[PDB]
């Protein structure tokens, strides 16, 4: 219950601050002003950094249980598979690195 | 001089100190002068529920000792 109350309170206050931040200036009654999809074009590089983040982020999901995994009796198996995951994460980086997937020059 | 920066830092320090001090004091106020019980695992929660029954007042932080033995 407490966590729900905390989240409700935090986002309730944030909401009130936002609306009063938008209403309080209307007290001034400032004068009227009367004076002012598709590609972006998007670079492929900015798409590829986002995708690389995602795939690296998925591999991090598999590594999060490591603190618990170290409590097992089969430590040799656990350590072998833990290093296997991190190494494949390094191999993903090495492949990206050596095919110029990490460059910003056009 | 550089020590005229301290008054603003002192205000920051007091503001950051309050949440930690408040939580500790409110916890002891609400749990009979003791630390709020930590129940991260079912076994700990199971004992806390048992204490709430054993207390006779429906509060897990009311402890019954050998006075209840007979």
């Amino acid at each position: 219950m407490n966590l729900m109350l905390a989240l409700l309170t935090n986002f309730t206050l944030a909401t009130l601050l936002v609306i009063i931040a938008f209403w309080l200036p209307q007290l001034n009654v400032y004068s009227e002003k009367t004076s002012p999809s598709a590609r972006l074009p998007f670079s492929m590089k900015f798409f590829l950094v986002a995708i690389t983040f995602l795939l690296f982020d998925l591999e991090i999901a598999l590594l999060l249980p490591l603190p618990w995994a170290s409590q097992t009796a089969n430590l040799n198996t656990m350590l072998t598979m833990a290093l296997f995951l991190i190494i494949l994460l390094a191999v993903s980086l090495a492949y990206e690195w050596t095919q110029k997937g990490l460059e910003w020059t056009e | 001089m550089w020590f005229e920066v301290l008054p603003g830092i002192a205000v920051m320090g007091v503001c950051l100190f309050i949440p930690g001090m408040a939580t500790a004091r409110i916890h002891r106020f609400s749990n009979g002068g003791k630390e709020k019980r930590v129940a991260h695992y079912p076994y700990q929660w199971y004992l806390m529920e048992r204490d709430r029954r054993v207390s006779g007042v429906n509060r897990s932080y009311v402890s019954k000792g050998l006075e209840n033995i007979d």
């Binding site: 409590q71 097992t72 009796a73 430590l75 350590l79 290093l83 190494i87 390094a90 | -």
Partner: protein, 83 residues
């Protein structure tokens, strides 16, 4: 050799971050197989009692199973106290 030592010199001059990264990773993969205290990690994990130790029905011929927890028989944690 000396060709090998020269190559290690060029990377240590140009890519010290990667040299450190491969050195640290290499130790991570090698030292566990060489360490004598690795065996204790397995023993300690097996000495942690998460579950109740269900008693055995005493048929009458289990000499090495203690009848009471403080009897001499059964696995000891003397090695752990000293470690």
């Amino acid at each position: 050799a000396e060709r090998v030592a020269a190559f290690l010199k060029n990377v240590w001059a140009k890519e010290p971050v990667l040299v450190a990264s491969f050195a640290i990773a290499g130790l991570a993969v090698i030292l566990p197989t060489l360490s004598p205290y690795t065996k204790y990690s397995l023993m300690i994990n097996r000495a942690t009692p998460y579950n109740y130790p269900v008693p055995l029905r005493d048929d009458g011929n289990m000499p090495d199973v203690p009848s009471h927890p403080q009897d001499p028989q059964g696995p000891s944690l003397e090695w752990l106290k000293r470690l």
